[PDB]
Amino acid sequence: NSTATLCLGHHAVPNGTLVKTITDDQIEVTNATELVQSSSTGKICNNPHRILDGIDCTLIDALLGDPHCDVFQNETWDLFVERSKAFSNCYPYDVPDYASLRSLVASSGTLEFITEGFTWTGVTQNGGSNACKRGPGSGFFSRLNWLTKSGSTYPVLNVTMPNNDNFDKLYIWGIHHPSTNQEQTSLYVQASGRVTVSTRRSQQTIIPNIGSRPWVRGLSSRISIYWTIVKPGDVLVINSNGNLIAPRGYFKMRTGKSSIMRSDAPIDTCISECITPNGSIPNDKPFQNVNKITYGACPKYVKQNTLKLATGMRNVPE
Amino acid sequence: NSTATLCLGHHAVPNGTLVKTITDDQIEVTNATELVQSSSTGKICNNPHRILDGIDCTLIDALLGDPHCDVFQNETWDLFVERSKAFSNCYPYDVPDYASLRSLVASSGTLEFITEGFTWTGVTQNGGSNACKRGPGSGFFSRLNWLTKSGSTYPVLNVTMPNNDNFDKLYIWGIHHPSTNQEQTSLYVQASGRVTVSTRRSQQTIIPNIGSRPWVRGLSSRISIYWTIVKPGDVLVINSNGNLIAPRGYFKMRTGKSSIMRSDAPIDTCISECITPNGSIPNDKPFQNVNKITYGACPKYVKQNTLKLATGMRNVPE
Amino acid sequence: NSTATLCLGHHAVPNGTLVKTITDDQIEVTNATELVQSSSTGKICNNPHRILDGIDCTLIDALLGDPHCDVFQNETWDLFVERSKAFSNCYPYDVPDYASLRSLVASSGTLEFITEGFTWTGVTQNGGSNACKRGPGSGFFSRLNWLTKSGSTYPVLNVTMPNNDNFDKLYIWGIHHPSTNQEQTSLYVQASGRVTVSTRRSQQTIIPNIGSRPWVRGLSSRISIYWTIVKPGDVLVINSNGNLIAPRGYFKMRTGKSSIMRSDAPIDTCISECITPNGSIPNDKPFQNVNKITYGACPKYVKQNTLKLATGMRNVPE
Amino acid sequence: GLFGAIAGFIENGWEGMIDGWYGFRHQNSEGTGQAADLKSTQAAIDQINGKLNRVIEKTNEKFHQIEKEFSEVEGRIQDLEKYVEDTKIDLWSYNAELLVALENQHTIDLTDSEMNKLFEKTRRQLRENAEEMGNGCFKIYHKCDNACIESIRNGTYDHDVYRDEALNNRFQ
Amino acid sequence: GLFGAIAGFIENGWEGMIDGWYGFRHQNSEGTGQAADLKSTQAAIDQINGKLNRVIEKTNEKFHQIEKEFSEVEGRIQDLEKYVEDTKIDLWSYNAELLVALENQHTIDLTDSEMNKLFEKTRRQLRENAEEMGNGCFKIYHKCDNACIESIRNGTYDHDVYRDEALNNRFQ
Amino acid sequence: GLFGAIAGFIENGWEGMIDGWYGFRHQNSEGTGQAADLKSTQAAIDQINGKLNRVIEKTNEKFHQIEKEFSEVEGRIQDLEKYVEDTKIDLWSYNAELLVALENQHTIDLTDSEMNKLFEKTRRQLRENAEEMGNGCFKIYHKCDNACIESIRNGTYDHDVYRDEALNNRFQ
Ligand SMILES: *[C@@H]1O[C@H](CO)[C@@H](O[C@@H]2O[C@H](CO)[C@@H](O[C@@H]3O[C@H](CO[C@H]4O[C@H](CO)[C@@H](O)[C@H](O)[C@@H]4O)[C@@H](O)[C@H](O[C@H]4O[C@H](CO)[C@@H](O)[C@H](O)[C@@H]4O)[C@@H]3O)[C@H](O)[C@H]2NC(C)=O)[C@H](O)[C@H]1NC(C)=O
Ligand SMILES: *[C@@H]1O[C@H](CO)[C@@H](O[C@@H]2O[C@H](CO)[C@@H](O[C@@H]3O[C@H](CO[C@H]4O[C@H](CO)[C@@H](O)[C@H](O)[C@@H]4O)[C@@H](O)[C@H](O[C@H]4O[C@H](CO)[C@@H](O)[C@H](O)[C@@H]4O)[C@@H]3O)[C@H](O)[C@H]2NC(C)=O)[C@H](O)[C@H]1NC(C)=O
Ligand SMILES: *[C@@H]1O[C@H](CO)[C@@H](O[C@@H]2O[C@H](CO)[C@@H](O[C@@H]3O[C@H](CO[C@H]4O[C@H](CO)[C@@H](O)[C@H](O)[C@@H]4O)[C@@H](O)[C@H](O[C@H]4O[C@H](CO)[C@@H](O)[C@H](O)[C@@H]4O)[C@@H]3O)[C@H](O)[C@H]2NC(C)=O)[C@H](O)[C@H]1NC(C)=O
Ligand SMILES: *[C@@H]1O[C@H](CO)[C@@H](O[C@@H]2O[C@H](CO)[C@@H](O)[C@H](O)[C@H]2NC(C)=O)[C@H](O)[C@H]1NC(C)=O
Ligand SMILES: *[C@@H]1O[C@H](CO)[C@@H](O[C@@H]2O[C@H](CO)[C@@H](O)[C@H](O)[C@H]2NC(C)=O)[C@H](O)[C@H]1NC(C)=O
Ligand SMILES: *[C@@H]1O[C@H](CO)[C@@H](O[C@@H]2O[C@H](CO)[C@@H](O)[C@H](O)[C@H]2NC(C)=O)[C@H](O)[C@H]1NC(C)=O
Ligand SMILES: *[C@@H]1O[C@H](CO)[C@@H](O[C@@H]2O[C@H](CO)[C@@H](O)[C@H](O)[C@H]2NC(C)=O)[C@H](O)[C@H]1NC(C)=O
Ligand SMILES: *[C@@H]1O[C@H](CO)[C@@H](O[C@@H]2O[C@H](CO)[C@@H](O)[C@H](O)[C@H]2NC(C)=O)[C@H](O)[C@H]1NC(C)=O
Ligand SMILES: *[C@@H]1O[C@H](CO)[C@@H](O[C@@H]2O[C@H](CO)[C@@H](O)[C@H](O)[C@H]2NC(C)=O)[C@H](O)[C@H]1NC(C)=O
Ligand SMILES: *[C@@H]1O[C@H](CO)[C@@H](O)[C@H](O)[C@H]1NC(C)=O
Ligand SMILES: *[C@@H]1O[C@H](CO)[C@@H](O)[C@H](O)[C@H]1NC(C)=O
Ligand SMILES: *[C@@H]1O[C@H](CO)[C@@H](O)[C@H](O)[C@H]1NC(C)=O
Ligand SMILES: *[C@@H]1O[C@H](CO)[C@@H](O)[C@H](O)[C@H]1NC(C)=O
Ligand SMILES: *[C@@H]1O[C@H](CO)[C@@H](O)[C@H](O)[C@H]1NC(C)=O
Ligand SMILES: *[C@@H]1O[C@H](CO)[C@@H](O)[C@H](O)[C@H]1NC(C)=O
Ligand SMILES: *[C@@H]1O[C@H](CO)[C@@H](O)[C@H](O)[C@H]1NC(C)=O
Ligand SMILES: *[C@@H]1O[C@H](CO)[C@@H](O)[C@H](O)[C@H]1NC(C)=O
Ligand SMILES: *[C@@H]1O[C@H](CO)[C@@H](O)[C@H](O)[C@H]1NC(C)=O
């Protein structure tokens, strides 16, 4: 022959991948990549964050000083893990504005407690109750003080405490709601109590409420739990004439990366930066479909289950 | 001739449509389609949802048992429609946290009320008032009980009620704020009242407030309305020594698609899946400019009034 | 020669600009434009809005009528500017729901106060206190009235005031929390007080709380501040038997463009439409990186610091 | 508008064309004619209908939500609710604008691309017997009848039968 | 970058060009020259200015909003407000990034498309007297003067006057 | 799909090609061959890898947030929190969909553009010795050996050596 031939073309594969475009919803390409992470290992790995396992203790129980929560003293964390089997085993209580206090303590990241010297003259300290057994005998919370009458009288308590340091202070106190009107005059001789806790910019006053309630762990009385924050330069004053659950000191307040999360996944010894209640997931893909509750450098939650990005040309087989 | 000619071209129309692009803001195409629905029929159609017309009754009035709201007993709905001409014609009252209770009852979708047997020993039941006439005589709400003194004394009421079923229970109760200090000792001999309603996880205590108020329907006293939710396994306890508006049973709580909406559009017999206060609108277009309050499979609300999508080529007339 | 040559080409510049595209992150073009404003002049200019400089007064102080805030009477604004050096120099007080009242008054835009004629029979008006000196002698707030006992008795105050106009009325009142139990019976002979303020649709009742508090400006007592809104056709009623800080009239409520902002930038005489705490910024660019707190026709806040839009072709130098 | 066919070297459109979107129009030794091209018309229509079905497909279904109209003045919570609502509306209107802006540009470009593809294919069919006149027409240098054009319309033009006389007519 | 004209078979740009964005440069039998092309320059400039006016147009106007900086620690409401604010900022920064990313790509592509359109039009003008040398230049096979190039620049080249001598110069 | 090379006048792909994405395949006077083209392959791969690195780059880092799962029924605040969460999720899923939809279209178009660029460059190399057959192949009108094709593959084809015999073979 006196001629030639030169043809051009591209490459193809026996089986491609289906992707979506602006016009067509199913087009075949030679290759694609996945962009949505849809699985978890099932374990919570403990690097490079600091994980604290709240085995049977909630955060408020470990804060108030429950008897079976005595290993969570002066602890620190980057993520508190609350299990679903957690229970309380002390005096029955209740916290008005529970979520506020839980999120306030969780985001601080410390249970460091400094003991201050209060002076309650005319009353008897260290009250106990058989519903909060600490060992072989009766007891109470470890960070609270139960003040009762001394012999035959209960004077008007008036105390003060300044803040000369350069950090905030968190005080936890409470009030005692009795069951009957005879339990009142046998613990605090006045037929009605009152608690006033004040700073130079705020005030809180509580009055107890006598009444019968369902039996919880053997009692029909209750305890209400309140808190106060004292900023530098300020000064705290406490005034009362009955039904006072006094504090013993103050927790320190911090600021940073710290949170709380409910999950029942076991804890392992990997390295991972994103944590979900289902476990830790790798964050090499931009999106995620595991859980909407996340902690750390995580992907973003989407409703889709698969999103494929084409990384080749169109597959036109022979 | 010894040649030919073959020319190519496209089609055009006498009048096109102006659309926006990335660069140009007004370009002419041969055809376009509209993407924003901007009108409503004016009527509310009653398929395939269940619409309940609250002619003169609000939801809280039909819940408490107003005399002129006695046709809304044991009713169910998928969308409650509240008119603007609605009024109350019974004892004057007020609900602290009104929006919470309204949205809690609306999202449940039932007014089914089961009657339970309470035993109030030592008091007189079924109190009435000429401000809530039921027929020719005096009456009260149909789901509440007004307890007064029996002869010369008013003992301390203490009652209990367990929950052995497998659903939540909703209890509605209240307290009575008198006008003077002589109206107190003539209905409840104690010079001060108190109401405590408790579960194994919560407690609420109210104290009445004596004082004069503006005349509404002929009275200067008031009634405050509170609620409680009892979960399975729990138990409700009520304690009081005056000023108690007692319950008669419990409403049942459900979960699903149900809501409430304020509108004055009449009701018709069409088929439509999206409902707005202006009426029902078709949902074949992806966007909408009628109202931002919607119920059902609706489009999305945008601020624009017209968005045209080109469905042809560029129109270049002769 | 018997031929020619005609070549085509484009233009280039010695130094281009680097922009980002879909594929490449650094490509060179012949020109670009900046889209993020990242600086402010430092001054707050006073056109075309109305700026009011709260030199040493906060909004609540200028509302209640502090002695050193007496130039902010009957004032109007479009943006209130609160400095950080502001202090109070009158009777110590506290507002429950402080943010609600601050945002309610700020968004109305007026301090116009109409004086109404109240009649308090049996009490002594115009009480003073050396902690709120007005000139050379003792005084009080300018919009409140301190009622005390008259000689040897303090009757039950019961007053009414209708609203026959066609606008809302805002009433500011309060209650006085004493320090001891002897300061009570020497100002209001009853050993306990109570304040009830009512409309035809609402009610508020407060009880004072006796107790000691930190010394602020020489006192240990306090004042709590509450408010009420009366709509047209309604009627206000006040009932009390002790501890009443009465009102003197009502503020008028409006609706429009008005707000409040904390900043320490000085005020100048320019023309500008967008205001940030750092000063006013021009709004010719679509985005902004100065502050997320803005007032007026402003750009939008983004996290990026530079976003360049290409306005030329690709630069391929010789 | 990127390929320069529509509104480019094609001056204007034909209003006597009602069969398809693109077509032919020949001037011969017996008289004028006109036809359409179903291939490109169907290609463009399929792409545009696919895009339309992509955008108008339904996604939203909400039943119980927050309060969005109020009758009194309360404070922090109401302000936060109004802020949330306004942010959502402002973020959806922007998407609504940008989507239409992008899709109109792409639609115009693809309808301009189909015309250039048809032209280039026709040019490759008449291998070396025709010359382009620059305004959309081709000049053929041999003698066709109505049975010659129909072969260039349905893809059966055999250029080896007319090549010699075309080469003699266009080079000498 | 899709059409392969700029940074493609056109090696590099000209820095002596200050009149327009695209132009010509001829080498003749009397000396070199240079010019510009206002048509394509104005087309590209109009499109880019339209896009610029599209993006920078003003839409935002807000007066009273929520609190975004706090001095104490309260709880649920403050956490919700900070969450709302952060969500809004994170959703607007993404739009700000994507818009610029898309528009830069489109601008580069349209400026590359104008050059190819000008080249193809010039090729269609010199019907069959010129040959493309592959690097952007055309070789003309007859003798032009400065009055021949100006006719290819303003659209009046009459190829029927030079066709015979070009055909004799380029085929023999 | 805008340029009409892949799935256009190129019928189908080659499955015996494992070196690169684009290549040649010649039929000569001594036997068949096959090769690849590293230039276009590397161009396309660099662009696609750049886009991939653009999308998968990490941005999110959040530590303390709001409550998103509740166990009891409270009221306004919980409803507002659920509304905020749902709005955020619905606004991010839309972005996730649109980004992939746009990028797949652009990737397909750029991989179709590289093939057309390679074809046009090859056509400009064989100046006037070859003719396009319309299906991707070129017909060369002189006699090459394996040392002639390798010169068209690495850019050293000197058309002035074969021009006269090609002109004599293809015009007579
Ligand atoms: C106001 O009204 C309330 C409501 O009725 C009254 O309270 C109840 O009060 C009684 C008083 O004792 C409570 O009784 C005790 O109940 C315990 C609960 O055990 C329960 O659980 C077991 C299984 O764990 C069940 O088998 C059992 O049926 C119960 O359901 C019992 O364990 C107690 O027995 C213990 O102590 C007494 C001595 O006090 C011994 O004689 C017994 O043998 C036994 O050892 C006891 O019977 C009851 O639980 C309360 N119910 C609720 C729902 O709270 C208030 O008393 C009333 N107020 C006044 C002032 O009258
Ligand atoms: C503390 O302060 C408050 C405020 O002043 C006092 O309350 C007012 O109390 C009086 C007491 O009776 C109320 O009076 C009654 O007003 C009714 C309202 O009718 C109104 O509406 C009609 C039109 O519908 C108007 O024409 C009329 O002017 C009123 O505006 C009257 O209808 C009543 O008349 C009925 O009963 C009396 C018997 O009690 C008959 O003699 C009359 O003829 C008539 O049939 C009556 O006059 C008044 O409405 C209250 N005002 C408000 C704003 O609440 C408290 O009394 C005071 N507390 C104490 C302990 O003193
Ligand atoms: C319940 O418990 C509280 C807490 O302790 C008691 O309150 C304190 O009460 C006392 C009572 O007077 C207050 O004392 C006064 O303090 C003033 C504060 O000055 C302070 O500031 C200066 C600098 O500005 C410091 O130098 C100084 O040390 C203080 O820190 C003093 O200025 C007062 O002096 C004035 O008046 C008295 C007469 O009363 C004169 O004799 C003095 O010379 C002087 O002129 C005075 O000393 C004290 O501030 C309160 N502290 C707090 C934190 O509130 C309650 O009294 C108690 N309740 C009952 C019923 O006992
Ligand atoms: C991650 O954990 C969540 C929490 O359980 C899982 O969510 C649920 O899925 C089950 C079964 O589909 C449902 O019955 C629950 O109602 C879901 N809970 C929700 C949505 O809160 C989720 O499926 C887990 N994901 C993976 C990948 O294991
Ligand atoms: C749907 O109903 C709403 C509710 O009335 C209408 O909204 C108002 O429009 C009027 C007149 O333009 C204004 O005076 C009101 O202030 C608007 N109310 C708002 C915005 O809440 C709306 O116009 C109706 N839409 C249609 C298409 O009829
Ligand atoms: C505008 O003002 C704000 C308020 O101060 C400035 O914000 C801060 O920047 C400094 C230094 O970078 C930080 O220490 C602060 O923590 C920042 N405060 C914030 C973020 O609330 C901001 O830098 C100013 N902007 C300009 C352009 O001057
Ligand atoms: C394409 O169109 C041509 C029109 O010329 C069709 O046919 C010719 O076909 C008729 C049918 O019998 C014959 O009589 C002629 O001799 C044919 N002429 C030529 C020049 O071939 C042809 O069949 C059509 N092809 C298809 C596939 O539709
Ligand atoms: C295009 O440019 C040409 C430059 O050659 C213009 O003109 C020629 O026009 C002059 C003007 O009188 C005559 O003297 C020459 O004889 C013309 N030469 C040819 C070859 O035509 C021409 O006028 C310009 N056209 C437009 C529309 O601007
Ligand atoms: C391009 O490929 C050709 C293959 O033909 C290379 O070379 C020829 O080079 C060999 C090497 O010595 C010589 O013996 C031949 O005579 C050459 N033939 C021709 C027709 O030139 C060439 O070197 C390659 N060029 C590059 C830059 O890689
Ligand atoms: C799918 O592709 C893989 C890898 O290319 C190959 O091994 C397998 O045989 C293919 N299967 C089918 C059914 O094409
Ligand atoms: C498809 O792409 C992935 C990465 O995106 C790569 O690992 C894989 O090898 C590719 N497939 C083939 C057949 O090369
Ligand atoms: C906890 O810390 C405080 C101060 O840091 C210290 O006084 C106390 O002894 C510590 N308690 C325990 C159990 O470590
Ligand atoms: C507009 O278009 C319609 C339908 O094509 C036609 O009937 C009408 O005459 C046109 N009007 C004008 C003014 O072009
Ligand atoms: C324009 O498109 C609509 C549907 O998008 C169609 O109903 C209408 O017939 C079209 N216009 C013409 C003239 O065909
Ligand atoms: C409402 O329902 C309850 C239980 O379902 C029933 O006992 C009662 O009679 C019903 N009342 C009416 C009016 O239907
Ligand atoms: C940068 O560009 C400017 C303006 O074009 C010019 O004056 C300057 O010399 C250039 N500098 C460099 C280093 O290219
Ligand atoms: C670049 O563009 C800006 C406006 O976008 C313009 O002011 C400037 O002159 C341009 N640069 C040059 C070199 O023309
Ligand atoms: C404030 O305004 C009221 C009514 O507008 C008026 O009675 C009063 O005198 C004014 N006071 C001052 C100081 O302008």
D-interface mutation test, from A19, A20, A22, most D Cβ less than 10 A away: A22
* Interface B:D, Cβ pairs < 8 A: 210
CB of C296 closer than 8 Å to CB of E61: yes
In 3D, which of B308, B313, B305, B318 has the Cα closest to residue B39?
A: B305
CB of C292 closer than 8 Å to CB of C306: no
A-interface mutation test, from B194, B198, B199, B207, most A Cβ less than 10 A away: B198
What distance in Å separates residue D14's CA from the closest CA in chain B? 5
3-class DSSP state of C272 = coil
CB of D6 closer than 8 Å to CB of D112: yes
What is the dihedral sign for C-alpha F132, F134, F136, F141?
A: negative
- H or E stretch at E40: helix E38-55
Which residues of chain B neighbour E47 with C-beta distances below 8 Å? Answer: 23-24
For a mutational test of ligand 6's pocket, the pick from C261, C276, C291, i.e. the residue with the most ligand atoms closer than 8 A to its C-beta, is C291
What is the dihedral sign for C-alpha B13, B15, B21, B25?
A: positive
C266: left (phi over 0), alpha (psi -120 to 50) or beta: beta
For residues B88 and B70, give the distance between their C-alpha atoms in angstroms, rounded to a whole number.
Answer: 13
CB of A161 closer than 8 Å to CB of A111: no
Which residues of chain B neighbour F79 with C-beta distances below 8 Å? Answer: 103
CB of B130 closer than 8 Å to CB of B138: yes
In 3D, which of C162, C227, C226 has the Cα closest to residue C200?
A: C162
3-state secondary structure chain B: CCCEEEEEEEECCCCCEEECCCCCCCEEECCEEECEECCCCCCEECCCCCEEEECCCCHHHHHHCCHHHCCCCCCECCEEEECCCCCCCCCCCECCCHHHHHHHHHCCCECCEEECCCCCCCEECCCCEEEEEECCEEECCCCEEECEEECCECCCEEEEEECCCCCCEEEEEEEEECCCCHHHHCCCCCCCCCEEEECCCCEEEECCCCCCCCCECCECCEEEEEEEEECCCCEEEEEECCCCEEECEEEECCCCCCEEEECCCCEECCCCCEEECCEECCCCCCEECCCCCCEECCCEECCCCCCEEECCCECCCC
Integer angstrom CA distances of residue E126 from C236, E148, E160: 94, 11, 10
Integer angstrom CA distances of residue A275 from A281, B242, F68: 7, 54, 15
Which is the closest atom of ligand 2 to the Cα of C235?
Answer: 53
Chain F interface includes A6 (CB < 8 A): yes
For residues B27 and B21, give the distance between their C-alpha atoms in angstroms, rounded to a whole number.
Answer: 8
Which residues of chain E neighbour D120 with C-beta distances below 8 Å? Answer: none
Q: How are beta strands C17-19 and C5-10 bridged, if at all?
A: unpaired
Q: Taking CB atoms and an 8 Å limit, are A211 and B200 in contact across chains?
A: no
| H-only helix segments in C139-298 | 182-185
C65: left (phi over 0), alpha (psi -120 to 50) or beta: left
Which residues of chain D neighbour F2 with C-beta distances below 8 Å? Answer: 109-110, 113
Which residues of chain C neighbour B212 with C-beta distances below 8 Å? Answer: 158, 196, 198, 237, 239
Longest dimension (CA), chain C: 129
How many whole angstroms from A82 Cα to the centroid of ligand 4? 18
For residues F128 and F131, give the distance between their C-alpha atoms in angstroms, rounded to a whole number.
Answer: 8
Paired residues of A309 in beta bridges: A33
Work out how many domains chain D is built from and give that number.
1
Ligand 5 pocket, residue B290 CB under 6 Å: yes
Interface of B with A in 162-221 (CB under 8 A): 194, 196, 198-203, 205
What count of other Cβ atoms lies within 10 Å of the Cβ of residue A135?
A: 7
Q: Taking CB atoms and an 8 Å limit, are B21 and D65 in contact across chains?
A: no
CATH number at residue E126: 3.90.20.10
Q: Determined by which method?
A: cryo-EM
CB of A300 closer than 8 Å to CB of A290: no
For residues C203 and B175, give the distance between their C-alpha atoms in angstroms, rounded to a whole number.
Answer: 14
For residues B76 and A227, give the distance between their C-alpha atoms in angstroms, rounded to a whole number.
Answer: 44
Which is the closest atom of ligand 14 to the Cα of B33?
Answer: 5
φ/ψ (deg, to 5) at C67: -65, -40
CB of B40 closer than 8 Å to CB of B279: yes
DSSP string, D132-169: E-SSSEEEESS---HHHHHHHHTT---TTTTHHHHHHH
What distance in Å separates residue A97's CA from the closest CA in chain E? 9
What distance in Å separates residue C102's CA from the closest CA in chain D? 9
What distance in Å separates residue A21's CA from the closest CA in chain D? 9
For residues E120 and E134, give the distance between their C-alpha atoms in angstroms, rounded to a whole number.
Answer: 13
b/e per residue B198-225 (b: at least 16 CB within 10 A):
bbbeebebbbbbbbbbbebeebbbbbbb
CB of C10 closer than 8 Å to CB of E17: yes
Residue with the two structure tokens 């010695």: C14
CB of F109 closer than 8 Å to CB of F1: yes
Paired residues of C159 in beta bridges: C238
CB of E13 closer than 8 Å to CB of C318: yes
Residues 6+ apart with CB under 8 A from A197: A171, A173, A203, A204, A226, A228, A236, A237, A238, A239
What is the dihedral sign for C-alpha C60, C64, C65, C66?
A: negative
Instruction: Look up residue C82 and give its DSSP letter.
Output: E
Q: Which of B196, B200, B205 has the CB atom closest to A216's CB atom?
A: B200
Instruction: Look up residue C107 and give its DSSP letter.
Output: T
Interface of F with D in 11-70 (CB under 8 A): none
CB-count burial class (<10 Å; 0-12, 13-18, 19+) for C30? buried
CB of C62 closer than 8 Å to CB of C314: no
For residues A204 and A198, give the distance between their C-alpha atoms in angstroms, rounded to a whole number.
Answer: 6
Interface of C with B in 36-75 (CB under 8 A): none
For residues B223 and B221, give the distance between their C-alpha atoms in angstroms, rounded to a whole number.
Answer: 7
For a mutational test of ligand 1's pocket, the pick from A179, A180, A182, A215, i.e. the residue with the most ligand atoms closer than 8 A to its C-beta, is A215
Residues 6+ apart with CB under 8 A from D26: B4, B5, B6, B7, D32, D33, D149
Which residues span the domain enclosing C136? Answer: 50-265
- H or E stretch at A99: helix A98-106
Residue with the two structure tokens 């020489």: C218
For residues B82 and D167, give the distance between their C-alpha atoms in angstroms, rounded to a whole number.
Answer: 87
What count of other Cβ atoms lies within 10 Å of the Cβ of residue D79?
A: 21
What count of other Cβ atoms lies within 10 Å of the Cβ of residue A70?
A: 12
Question: Two tokens at E65?
Answer: 């909003």
Residues 6+ apart with CB under 8 A from C186: none
3-state secondary structure A228-294: EEECCCCEEEEEECCCCEEECEEEECCCCCCEEEECCCCEECCCCCEEECCEECCCCCCEECCCCCC
DSSP string, C109-155: -B--EEE-----TTEE----EEEEEETTEEE--SSEEE-EEBTTB--
Integer angstrom CA distances of residue F171 from B3, D167, F130: 20, 8, 12
| H-only helix segments in chain C | 59-64, 98-106, 182-185
Question: Two tokens at A35?
Answer: 């962009």
Question: Two tokens at C98?
Answer: 């402080």
In 3D, which of B75, B76, B56 has the Cα closest to residue B66?
A: B56
CB of E126 closer than 8 Å to CB of E120: no
Longest dimension (CA), chain B: 129
Residue with the two structure tokens 């029927």: E160
Task: Assess whether the previous peptide bond of A178 is cis (omega < 30° from 0).
Answer: no
Instruction: Look up residue E142 and give its DSSP letter.
Output: S
For residues B258 and E81, give the distance between their C-alpha atoms in angstroms, rounded to a whole number.
Answer: 27
DSSP string, A12-44: --SS-EEE--SS-S-EEES-EEE-EE----S-E
What count of other Cβ atoms lies within 10 Å of the Cβ of residue C268?
A: 15
Question: Two tokens at E51?
Answer: 């896009």
φ/ψ (deg, to 5) at A275: -125, 130
Long-range contacts: D154-158, Cβ < 8 Å, 24+?
A: D155/D125, D157/D125, D157/D126
**F interface with C, Cβ–Cβ below 8 Å:** 47-48, 50-51, 54, 103, 106, 110
For residues F84 and F66, give the distance between their C-alpha atoms in angstroms, rounded to a whole number.
Answer: 10
For residues E147 and B292, give the distance between their C-alpha atoms in angstroms, rounded to a whole number.
Answer: 69
3-class DSSP state of C258 = coil
DSSP string, E58-95: ----B--------SS---HHHHHHHHHHHHHHHHHHHH
CB of E1 closer than 8 Å to CB of F3: no
Q: How are beta strands C249-252 and C113-115 bridged, if at all?
A: antiparallel
Exposure on the CB side of residue A128, measured as CA atoms within 13 A:
10
Question: Two tokens at A265?
Answer: 């996944």
Residues 6+ apart with CB under 8 A from D3: D109, D112, D113, D115, D116, E113
Torsion from C-alpha of A16, A21, A26, A28, nearest 10 degrees: -20
CB of C178 closer than 8 Å to CB of C98: no
For residues F43 and A145, give the distance between their C-alpha atoms in angstroms, rounded to a whole number.
Answer: 76
For residues E116 and E122, give the distance between their C-alpha atoms in angstroms, rounded to a whole number.
Answer: 10
In 3D, which of B247, B153, B150 has the Cα closest to residue B197?
A: B247
User: What length does chain F have?
Assistant: 172
Residues 6+ apart with CB under 8 A from A118: A145, A159, A161, A246, A247, A248
CB of B243 closer than 8 Å to CB of B175: yes
For residues B35 and C87, give the distance between their C-alpha atoms in angstroms, rounded to a whole number.
Answer: 56
In 3D, which of D142, D145, D112, D146 has the Cα closest to residue D127?
A: D142
Q: How are beta strands A287-288 and A36-37 bridged, if at all?
A: parallel
CB of F137 closer than 8 Å to CB of F14: no
For residues D110 and F3, give the distance between their C-alpha atoms in angstroms, rounded to a whole number.
Answer: 10
Tell me which chains share at least 3 CB pairs under 8 Å with chain C: A, B, D, E, F
Paired residues of A82 in beta bridges: A54, A262
Integer angstrom CA distances of residue F47 from B229, F40, F109: 61, 11, 12
Instruction: Look up residue C68 and give its DSSP letter.
Output: G
What count of other Cβ atoms lies within 10 Å of the Cβ of residue D60?
A: 17
Question: Two tokens at E71?
Answer: 């001095």
b/e per residue F157-170 (b: at least 16 CB within 10 A):
beeeebeeebbebb
Question: Two tokens at B72?
Answer: 């809304």
Chain D interface includes B17 (CB < 8 A): no
φ/ψ (deg, to 5) at A8: -115, 155
Which residues span the domain enclosing F146? Answer: 1-172
Torsion from C-alpha of C172, C176, C177, C183, nearest 10 degrees: 180
Instruction: Look up residue D68 and give its DSSP letter.
Output: -
Which residues of chain C neighbour F103 with C-beta distances below 8 Å? Answer: 22
3-class DSSP state of F170 = helix
Number of H helices, E strands in chain C: 3, 30
For residues C197 and A12, give the distance between their C-alpha atoms in angstroms, rounded to a whole number.
Answer: 84
In 3D, which of E86, F56, E97 has the Cα closest to residue A37?
A: F56
DSSP string, F36-84: --HHHHHHHHHHHHHHHHHHS-----B--------SS---HHHHHHHHH
Task: Assess whether the previous peptide bond of C286 is cis (omega < 30° from 0).
Answer: no
CB-count burial class (<10 Å; 0-12, 13-18, 19+) for A306? exposed
In 3D, which of C42, C47, C39 has the Cα closest to residue C270?
A: C47
3-class DSSP state of A219 = strand
Residues 6+ apart with CB under 8 A from C276: C40, C263, C290, C291, C293, C294, C295, C298
Residue with the two structure tokens 């109004």: D82
Residues 6+ apart with CB under 8 A from F152: A6, F122, F125, F126
Residues 6+ apart with CB under 8 A from A248: A113, A115, A116, A118, A143, A144, A145
CATH number at residue C80: 3.90.209.20
Q: How are beta strands F137-140 and A5-10 bridged, if at all?
A: antiparallel
Which residues of chain E neighbour C9 with C-beta distances below 8 Å? Answer: 10, 13-14, 17, 22-23, 25, 136
Number of H helices, E strands in chain F: 4, 3
Residues 6+ apart with CB under 8 A from A223: A91, A92, A93, A94, A174, A175, A176, A177, A245
Ligand closest to CA D157: 7
What count of other Cβ atoms lies within 10 Å of the Cβ of residue A101?
A: 20
